[model samples]
Target chain A: MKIRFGICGLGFAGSVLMAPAMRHHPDAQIVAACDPNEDVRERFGKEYGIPVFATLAEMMQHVQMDAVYIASPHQFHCEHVVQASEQGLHIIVEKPLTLSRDEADRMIEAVERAGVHLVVGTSRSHDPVVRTLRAIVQEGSVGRVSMLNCFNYTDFLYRPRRPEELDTSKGGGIIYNQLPHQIDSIKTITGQRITAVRAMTGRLDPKRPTEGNCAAMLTLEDGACAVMVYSGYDHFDSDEMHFWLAEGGRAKQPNHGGARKVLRQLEGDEAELRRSRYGFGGPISKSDRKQPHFGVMLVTCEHADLRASPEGVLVYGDEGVREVPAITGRGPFSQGDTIDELRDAIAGVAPALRDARWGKDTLEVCLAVLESSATGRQVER
Target chain B: MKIRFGICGLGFAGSVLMAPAMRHHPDAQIVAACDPNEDVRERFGKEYGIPVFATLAEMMQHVQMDAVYIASPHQFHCEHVVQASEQGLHIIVEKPLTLSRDEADRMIEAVERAGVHLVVGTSRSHDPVVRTLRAIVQEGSVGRVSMLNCFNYTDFLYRPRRPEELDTSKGGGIIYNQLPHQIDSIKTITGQRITAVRAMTGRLDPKRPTEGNCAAMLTLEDGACAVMVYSGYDHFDSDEMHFWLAEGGRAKQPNHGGARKVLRQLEGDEAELRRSRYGFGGPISKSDRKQPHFGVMLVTCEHADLRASPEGVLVYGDEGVREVPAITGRGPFSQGDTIDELRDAIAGVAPALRDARWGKDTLEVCLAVLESSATGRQVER
Candidate 1:
């Protein structure tokens, strides 16, 4: 039977990215959506011919769906997930699964009490290249993984943002919005929890008024180590290291400082209006390529080193380098994989790898990064 | 006036690398040489038409020179430097600058008392790209430096090694042999001393006993941060990040696992003999290109990000990316820069930047890395 889905938050991620993936999946259907913006609701309703509401409670009263995908802002994730779980609907929430450990724990408790499946995704962990790397690690073909090196340089901070998106207290900045992908990807590949972390975060741009970069050293429970460095200053493009392929798994031309330049030309409200153009019923391009990735990641094991190429994962072993081709035709952002994961959880085909508990664990590490940066000490699990 | 030079330890670095740079410079001339190996001394005496002796004391007694270039093994660096300084000869010492901080302290004291100049090089700090990057930082064109990210992966662990080279106590392994280049480069570029470090070191291969890889997060006195990761395992080649230019600044063809495969077939003595073939009178190729580097380094500042390209330094700023071309004909290893620094020091033209005290400070950071890794804590300077 088809799994009816209700999408909460008809912004860019909900309507433009996730709704299309749900509609295309044979076993998944977007039956309803909720948004506070009247224009977004009207546009989504007309585009999908589905019922739309102004709030999650309004959508729950009129819609009959087996699951809900929560794509609200960072501060609203906990309330949305709890409301959906209380309705006995399975849940798919975008990262970071809530900001604080307390909020994450509350959401996890609600989902667990409801006896409903809860998966967190659209993270790089769901990307085929990362999944393949995980499988390779599981097979022990690369020997015991010893080190993971992950780094990314993007225009994240310079991108157009709503007021709350720039507030670190409200789960804003790279530590919350970007680090979930890297932390989750590393944990998934090694199948281990981070035991401790020492990190430094940079807030170099006076205009940005928030952290624009970070570097962290993570120690896993089994002694494997990972070093992650990310800069959203719009300076160096890490896509240079990834064969010029954007994180969306599509070839990207070099447009250095394009984001920051555009942001500089507009005021806050005007920039927000421009951002709304990518909301519900926004124009979005599609591509059939390898898979999405967070950035450049190198996993060095005793027997081999693994990293992602434009086409797939490159395994450099004692026998030499070889490619493990990724599955194609997934959504450009790997949204199709997220849908597949949710469907599999609904059917009880297997345990959900990125369940609410895993999301909570990942959030713990991200919080530790901030804590370590502030205290100038290693924060232990 | 030519600055007369005495060569110590006719090993690969002294005979094949530095000697040629000294010989080519108009202001530098070799007057004598010394090594414990009779064959190496004999080869040096014949090749350079200079007096050769089996001991530093013998060389000092028989030959007159303005300075000595010390390229002896790690354990002998202290004794050789002390002897050279007592003889009132200026000194240029290969990296690690002697093993322990105490040894470095003693060598520094000797040079101070004797009124002789001491400079450390053939380091990546001497590379033209690094020097130009330092100039940009000093210019304040990029604003204040916030972070430095450096990483490298190579077949260092699998290379031919003498028994002493694999012993950690004698300054073996990448910490002493290689980290000096990276540490010195960071210190030189930022002009800040590292205040603390938290690091992890790995020994993944039993066949190759010491630490094979390391990841570190360093905090500078000025509050800027640097993250460094280096893997000597043969699986990943970081030259891929540097446009396939090897550390020697030559175009390198991919030879994956070639070092380890050859190493696995040799006995201890055979490996030592094979290594000697690259010593005095050994065949060495020369390249005229951009100066050498220690893998990939990205320096993030408030206004721009800086990194070494194959030809020069690439500065990514708000305006656009621009190339700051490096000086050429400076020897592939940038030994010419080291020779210039020495000549300028002896000529009283300028103060030496990488003097004995600077080398000692770099050693302090390296030792802190080891201490932090062993104790699982942040080590303070």
Candidate 2:
């Protein structure tokens, strides 16, 4: 049984991210889309052959969508989620569920009252490589996770953003817009909750006028410590941090495609830089449709340290380092596994790891990190 | 003009370490030796052609010694240091200057009162590779040090031990005997004081009833964090942790001779395992005399990550990964630079990085690590 999803918002996540992933997904069908802009709605409707509505309310009134996949602007998540739940539909909302904690809580209540499964698109949590890492840790391939070091450096601020992205209160900046991927991945990898954090955030470039860098130390529930560093200054691409290897590569050579494409596009015009440029040219190739959004992550445990490569993962252990090329993904943009989970969830079978509550908890950690950086002290969970 | 010295203890450090390095040293010479055992004293005296004495008092009475480098057992450090100071001789003592904090304080007071320079052999602090890493962090080559990850694994428990080596009360474990290298090197690298620590130790092997595995999380005064993991189980050789490409590899290859020989020897008689086996043999070659005792270490900073290689250092930075082979050592057994620094300190010139007070502070951290592990809580430094 396929759950038909009506996607609200046809920008990056909707037009490029969701529809393409849905195409590859085995169990879900994106039958309708709702966006305020005519160019976006009509273009998406024509491309995907889905009926387009000007607003989610119109889609609710007219289209038969078993669920709603909301990927709208930050301020609209709460509204779209409430409306979709009121219409008695399952929900798969993009991160961070909502900009306001109160809004997330209300959405949580609404979804429960409506008796529909609520899945938050914590994308990296569903990456095959990430899934393998989580399994390895759970199985004690590495005894106990002692520490985790994660770093991401790219031209994030340079990516096109709407007017709201320039304003932090509207849930802008790398912390709200991008850091969830890292935070959620850590949560997923360790199967532990973040207990405390001390952080320092940076808004190094005046032109971006938003926090672009963060260096943070996190304490996990199991006493494992983790450090997360991110710089989206569009200057240094940390994709090479994994030594030009990744989990998405095939046989002989690693697919240098991800980092190279990022670097090449970074040489675009100033006008294009000022506008939203990423995920615009929707999959010039089929592989691009499933292109990965992020790069390598290295997790250190008691017995071994694992590095995610394009082919699989590099495990450095007592026996010696070896590569496990078991997990591979289409790319960061693909969420076929997430859709499968959603399908399983709707059928009363299995659900995704990231539910409404987990998303809420992840949000609280992000909120705590902001507070820690703001106050220059540790935030206790 | 060389600073002639008397060497106490004539054991592994005194015979294989001090004598070999002094032979290579340009500024210092060992003119006399002291050991209670006649056979050991006679052997050292015959090999180095130095006058031998039954005690430091006799060495002080008979030999025209300018200083004494005390490599006696840990418990005897205070007695030898105080005796050397009483005779107004400058002092250089092996690490963990004294077993107790009060003894260290008393030794410090004696050295201060006598007005002779006090130098402790925190050898890693003097390593050119270590120094380069420190400079790189200080200069912000890798930006601010947000976190440091360090690990060392060897079959330390299976090695020969003195009667005292198996007793925790006598400072026989890895915490007392080996951790100073890490603490002192971090101190030199960051120029920050450790504010607090939480650690867990394991004594899994019954034959070696002392803490051999320690996983610790430390907070630096500068808001940076660090994790130190050392497992001396001898089951894992972290020498291969570098993907067989070490930093200090020479024209041909690294001398993996140390760990290989230890593993081979362990395959011998059970009687040998019961014997006090560490450092029994003198340097087998000139290279062996100058060999390094420890292996690779990694430091992650705000902008870059560094790994210590035998040749120099491996810098993973914003520019891309590159190996900086600037720092090379004669080998682990070399202490020529340590001797030179002691000579300079006595002559009112340069000084060793870790003098008595610094060693005392380093001891405090090790003591705290033991406390933290025992109590299962964070210890304030």
Candidate 3:
């Protein structure tokens, strides 16, 4: 039987992406959903034909499901995961798996006590390109991994944000929202913990008023190096480097300054409305394409260099460059692979690569990046 | 009247590129040359129809020259500069300006006492693309500068090298040889001093046995940031990111593993012979194209992002991306612009940007990168 699921916080991730992804997966089914917004709840319920509730407690009491997808904002993850675990439901939580190490420990303890699996879903690590690169490294196809370079330029800061989303103290900024995927992907590819991080975060745009750009140098346990440069200012689109394919492996049309332009014109409920347009019954509800990725990633080993192509990983080895195809079917973001991992986890066929512990480890690196930036010193793990 | 030149060191820079550049320029002439190596001295003397001496003192005793181009190995720069300066000659020294800050100070003192101009030539900062980008930033076309990214990957470590070239203590390795260009470029583009550096260096290949890769985050005095990633490993060629253009802005044909292949077969003086093939009267000598650049560089500003294109700088502004064309005539390895800067400096039309103090500052950043990598702490200026 398909694993019945309850989705919590039916916003962009839950309603727009995850809920539909769950419905599409053959082994996963969305049986219910919960959201604080009455309009969002109505839209999700009507679209999915599922019962809707205003809170996780209410959903747990009223609905029967094997798992809950915690897609709430950063601050609520710990509470939602603990609440769902108490009801004997497995959980699929969005990154960063909560803000602090202490909260992550609390969620982990609750899940262990309840004897249920918890997987961190939809991180770029779940993308097939990342996994394929990891496999190549593990198999020693290119010998020992030496370096990793990841770069992304997007309009992240200019996107509509709830006030809390712009506050770093409460898990705001790209350090919390975006770096987890990069950290996880690097860690996964090398299979080594990050031993140290030296980084600089820039709040270049006073209008947006958050740390919108960062450049970091991370050292792996074995002394391999990774450089990550990200700019969310929208001035340059890295898609230009990736054959104009976006993060979702779809052809992307260039929209220079589009986000900032819309942000400039936004007023009252307009920002919230624009954000909701991607929710469950919103304008962008479905897609059929390859898995999403973080911008461009290059993995350099002793004998080969690997990077993501639109369809697969391009391995430039001692012999020559060749594409290793691993087609990732469309399920919005990396939802297809995320569900597959979660389903395997519940079936006890294989453990989830992005389990609670993995999530916590990735969080530590993210926190270290910010700490290093703040102190102007390398942070050692 | 043309500026008469005495070249100290008949090696790669002096004989191969700079000597030809001097001959080709309408305003410069080479009258004498010096090198300890008899074969290199002989080849350079015969090729250029000039007197070649065994040492700078011998050349100085016999030659009447207005300026001396010091192209000796890193260890000899300080001595050569002082000797040339004492002869009442203007000076153009190669990069790193001498190894230590102490040596740099000594050279600066000698040049000051002699009341002669000293210009650091043949650096990537001399590339017209870099100058145009700096002008764009200075012009406020991009508003306040926020971020810069520079990446380069080459078969540097695997190339044929003298014993000292692989050692770090004697001003060897990419830190001294390659990073000067990158450091100078970033500093020139922003027109800001690097106030701090945090970095990690990697020696992934046991066979090469040197620090072959490094990733660094540099903080400018104004809080702008620059990230530099370099790998000398043969696995990845960042020229792939630059439209297959080599650092000299010439069309680059991909030759994966070619350097390593030749390196593996070397024995006795084979490596030295291979090295000399690029010297004066060697198989490869002159070129006519855009000036040489370091690898790919991107500058993010308040209003735009700038990167190097083949013929110019590509500015991706709020409106749209446009190419700002600045033709850099080829003189092999930025020698064209290097001579121009030196000419202007001597003429008192424009002081050389990469002067003695600028070289010392860039050297400080390079040393800081090594120190930070070694100590696992940020090195503050």
What is the CAPRI rating of model 3's predicted complex?
Answer: medium
DockQ of every candidate: 0.72, 0.16, 0.56
Q: Rate the local accuracy (lDDT) of all candidates.
A: 0.84, 0.69, 0.81
Residue B325, candidate 3: alpha-carbon lDDT = 85
- lDDT of each residue in A3-28, candidate 1, tens digit only: 89999987777877788878887778
Q: Please identify which of the two predictions, 1 or 3, would achieve the higher DockQ against the true structure.
A: 1
**How many Å off is the CA of A112 in candidate 1?**
1.3
TM-scores for the candidates: 0.96, 0.81, 0.93
Model 3 chain A: worst 10 consecutive residues (lDDT sum)? A325-334
- Choose the strongest candidate by TM-score: 1
TM-score of chain A considered alone, across all candidate predictions = 0.95, 0.87, 0.95
- Assess the local accuracy of residue A199 in candidate 2 as a C-alpha lDDT between 0 and 100: 68
The candidate 1 chain A region of ten consecutive residues with least summed lDDT is: A281-290
Give the C-alpha lDDT of model 1. Answer: 0.84
Winning model by lDDT: 1
**Residue B181, candidate 3: C-alpha displacement in angstroms:** 1.4
